[PDB]
């Protein structure tokens, strides 16, 4: 099952982290620096599968973005990679133009979307169109 | 391109020739060496300092790869003869090549140098610049003086050399001359006037960037450990100013300790008093270490520093208390049976032990003054909870302290020594610890009569030896002062 | 010797990289980026070694200078080489900036290929013969830096001056120069120590040479004794309960009354718990800055053998009063038009035997510019 | 829309070095406390903007210390946005409180009695994302009431199922096993595939923990697999990504089946075989979408099918075909394909029917290791060899992997050395070869070996008896090397100091030569090292009084007697005093041969 | 300032 979720830039500024089990802040932050160190040294021509101690990380690039995903040992990785790709697709089609400023200013919207299709460490919703419909109906009311 | 490289090596213009040689010398393939063996012969022999220098560097680069080659040895011989060249740069890069290949070491290295070559390289030193001067200097840190004649002459030859490159060339010269201090201290007094000469240039080097200050300060500390009788009373100068980088501060304090004398007690105590007020943990620890070393150095400082460290003990900061613990252990090892009253305070602040070394110091101390303490037995018994995961050194320290205390007072440590011996003999993955346990089991079961002959024997003092280094290690560093080795304080036998 | 040579900016990316040996790998530069820029453990040494890999680092502007090797070379030579690289960069394109570094690819590559091969540094040598000047003129600049640690009890704790010579010559031919100063060691001063340019000949010791064209530095020297103190600072600290401090600082002008000081800066220490300070100044302007804990009083001009002082009321916030405030020294920064060392130039015998013009054809120009180095008065 | 949050974010984000932002955030902290404590707390825009700003500040890297009851206030509100922001604050900020927990319980139980996806969704999201004890206790049987024989909004059903799964992960003990499985094993056939996914998650967890309750699902789920594997070219494009119909549910049900033994029902097994063959055959034809994601999804389904096959083990021929297909992937162009294929081969090596094929591919594994230039694959192949290790294997394996250690960067060095030691311990045929491998490795790496490995080799040596002389001879032959490591000094000093009697016969290894070598290496030592050397010297004195005069000379130096270290001085005094007597009775008595080390 | 030497 999913341990936690990371989206980071080239420098390493922390915009989003989302956990599912009890964890302290100091270990969380240090994990942030070493996962940053691991991810930042790679490039395009490497398999997106890495193993460290008791966990494994999936991390795909977009322009200048690091999207890091932490899960258990026996989960089906490339399925999660497809899920992340679909996530990026739906975020792109949402704004008609995806950018870092959308993440900065629509953080609550991102929270709602990930809650709408990521809960308790598992995929919740996979259908793009239903997500879009739910988004349209829930953005409507105040 | 290799054929084009040779053709460019045949170009009338020397620049293209040198460019081709330089380009060939950098590529590392199995056949470049044998291929450029023939062109490179007539590039070492050419009507240009540029071409000859480039070909010398390329010979150096050539020998490093795939080149044992008889023609490579002919290259070496031609280069050695080209030491007699009219270009300072050509001979500079030639001797640089020679020194580098001297690192490749089938015991047949450097191949040369004798009085004639010595005069030639003196002339080169006159007529070359920084790089070549350093190459000559560190190449000549390999000669062995036959007698005082040439040593004398070369030392006047080099003494004026407070030169343009300063740090590099000057410290290389210091390397060479420190190597060639073999003459007895009071000769025809070139020795004494050289001793007077050395202080100014050494002082001048503390005025660069903080990093060269650090490098020079490391070197100075090493030399001071080697010889304290050079900067005898310049303790005033190296006082730390309040905006140094911290490492410079630390080693400056170490040198302060190295040079404190009978006149220096007041200034040193004041100095350590303002330095103690700093907030850096390492700074404070080394400062109280310096306090302890000053205490060791003389008796009035001893009593004053004991008083100050007791004050620091009632400051209740744990780590400084443990450092002062180690300090007072050393003091008792040097000046015993004078300050035993502090042991009660130490036992009161015995709950503040969180470091293995300080715990070992308390264990050894309570072992020592078992006659003083009737209560330390219960304390060490409480410390008996951790047999494993308590570091081997602490295990050995508790073992020896307990056995000695039992030797002194067998009436109430019988079951303790049998249980600790059983634990040592039945759980030790440490072979040496198991052997030691067996030794003391076959010793306390033989006679306390001989054990007190062995164990109870008193130990000699320390006599002001703060933070010294192994002699031969220092000597081998005196072979390599200017390089990384001196700063690292550890020989190339640990890094290759 | 040296293999890879890498440079960063403050943002941390690689700017220009060239490796002269097979030993160095990308792991080196990556570890340098992570363990220096991205490591928050600040306290270090200017050099470092990890897993038998030596790293050399220095920061100028916002630019890191990285050098890596495997063998036991001398550090000073490589450091001089790095300084030379930075200085030639500054000479070639002025201010060192990221885009300024970037727009010089061909320059960087040709210089690194020429000046440096496989880690080996490659490069009358100061003046040619065809230099001509119908107006034989030279300029003298006397730059001296004063350093003082001053006690609250009125004694000089430490004093030493670093002095350098700056001269601008424009003369015809191959002038033969003899420098004359009071080297008696009656006007006379003592030279504690001195280092020279390559042109200086050893054979009182006088300087005989042929000067390099234009501006150059003849010699570097240090002075520690018989230094004329530019200023005297009088500290006075008074405690007013737990709410106020009464500190009045008096400074003495220890130079000629005919000499007017310029750009006088006095930094008066105050605790961090200072609730406020009221500034009083009869000369210049006085300011209080609670941020950096200082009182700023600046004096435009104020004559020698004179005195000036500031009346200050330092209002303290009540706090843990048991830990008393450790007073930093009173620091002053200034520029003086005279040399604190006291050096006096007897003459400068410049003769041209080749060309048929006399010494009277030389226009010799001299001025003194003294600067403050470290000038702190403990209180 | 909303502008104030944007203005705030622009203001603080566009700041210089962090000190200026610190003063800015301090001024803003003063402003926000002044607005909250004191002033008028308005309902919608004022406090909404305030709490949004505070949340942005908190996520920026700072802390929020107040406005928690005024954060519960947003939960007790009419508007969707206010409650949503309040939920955001309470979920992101969870501190040690009890009144807050009770108020959250009250609000959640009051809001759950709604009839819209929004409210129950927000409540279930709050429960699942954080979770506490009492809040899970209040809906132990309430969530089932939603999920028994009651159908709500399908997204609401998904949320309830996932929340119950999260609570069971947190509190398996506090989850009843009432008669509600029937509908759970009924709704698997439901059309909505998201509900299918959530139910499959819950069923996977529960059935893998409680096999007995969910045995009914098998036939229905395999029928779902049969219908979904070939449905249409446009069946549920709502749930179809890049021409691939529902890969995730196929993978998930394949994983689901692994909690049970091979199905008994012949129809189920036959339809499963036909379906997997169909999977193979569609994998046969070239991809219908040149974008890689099509291939990724199809190969994901394929690999999960392979996992089902390997766990349940129905067919020998199918296993060999899977091995061949994976082998084809081991040199495939795609790197991720190679990684997943090699992992699946690591799994498949355990299949004894295709283990012969795997063994024939051990050379391919070696080549892929030596051609990777990607690090990870090499230690994965090392793990594969570890799995496939027997005696002869162990032999050629350790040869190749010591070569692959002399080609190793920094760390895989040390842990592969650790497994080399344990593998030699497990598979030692001749103990001379064992110590030979130990010395070869300490030669190759040296710096990164252990402190307990040589403990273990000393234990083995002292327990093996006969090899001790050969071991000592080999050690003495080894230490004559010019470059000498410091740990080699420890091991050689101990072994020779305790067995010098056997080896001193040879003049080249005479006791004189032994002591000469020891005192030569003496100056390359740590303090524990020279303590051990002192102990070996005194034991050597026990071995041969012949050299004792020189020995007595050596430790009599000022450097040792007036040494600045406690334990070294103590050892010197002890050895000097016992050599002073040297009655040869106590000297021999105390210094025995030493009983062999018992095994831990 | 500069003065005539």
Describe the structure.
This is part of a larger assembly, with chains A (142 residues), B (496 residues), C (379 residues), D (600 residues) and E (5 residues). Chain A is of the alpha+beta class and 142 residues long. Chain A has one domain: Beta-Lactamase, CATH 3.30.450. Chain A has five helices and seven strands, in the order ββαβββαααββα. In chain A, the strands form two sheets. In chain A, strands 2-1-5-4-3 form a five-stranded antiparallel beta sheet, with helices on both faces. Chain A has a two-stranded antiparallel ribbon with strand order 6-7. Chain A is globular, with a radius of gyration of 15 Å. Chain C is mainly beta. Chain C folds into three domains: 1-123, Beta-Lactamase (2-Layer Sandwich); 124-228 and 339-379, Mu homology domain, subdomain B (Immunoglobulin-like); 229-338, Immunoglobulin-like (Sandwich). In chain C, strand 1 and strand 2 (14-19) form a beta hairpin. The longest helix of chain C has 19 residues, at 75-93. Chain C is flat. By secondary structure, chain D is an all-alpha fold. Chain D has a single domain, classed as Leucine-rich Repeat Variant. In chain D, a hairpin with a 2-residue loop joins strand 1 (240-241) and strand 2 (244-245). In chain D, helix 29 packs parallel to helix 32. Chain D is extended and about 100 Å long. Chain E is an all-beta fold and 5 residues long. In chain E, 0% of the residues lie in helices and 60% in strands. Chain E has no helices and one strand. Chain E starts with a strand and ends with a strand. At the A-D interface, helix 2, helix 4, strand 7 and helix 5 of A face helix 1, helix 3, helix 5, helix 7 and helix 10 of D.
Which pair of protein chains has the largest interface, and what are the residue counts? A-D, 42 and 53 residues
In terms of DSSP E residues, the strand content of chain B is under 5%
Distance between the termini of chain B: 36 Å
Query: What Rg of chain A is obtained from the alpha carbons, in whole angstroms?
Result: 15 Å
Number of discrete domains of chain A: 1
Broad CATH class of chain A: Alpha Beta
The name of the CATH architecture of chain A is 2-Layer Sandwich
The SSE string of chain B, one letter per element, is HHHHHHHHHHHHHHHHHHHHHHHHHH
| DSSP strand count of chain B | 0
Q: Give the N-to-C terminal Cα separation of chain A.
A: 34 Å
CATH class of chain B: Mainly Alpha
- DSSP helix fraction of chain B: 55-70%
Question: What share of the residues of chain A does DSSP label as strand, in percent?
Answer: 25-35%
Largest sheet of chain A: 5 strands, antiparallel
Give the number of helices of chain B.
26
Instruction: Please tell me the CATH architecture of chain B by its name.
Output: Alpha Horseshoe
User: What would you give as the CATH superfamily of chain B?
Assistant: Leucine-rich Repeat Variant
**Looking at CATH, which topology of chain B would you report?**
Leucine-rich Repeat Variant
Query: In the CATH scheme, what's the topology name of chain A?
Result: Beta-Lactamase
Domain MHD (chain C): 135-378
Modified residues (Phosphoserine) (chain C): 45
Family (chain C): Belongs to the adaptor complexes medium subunit family.
Organism (chain C): Mus musculus
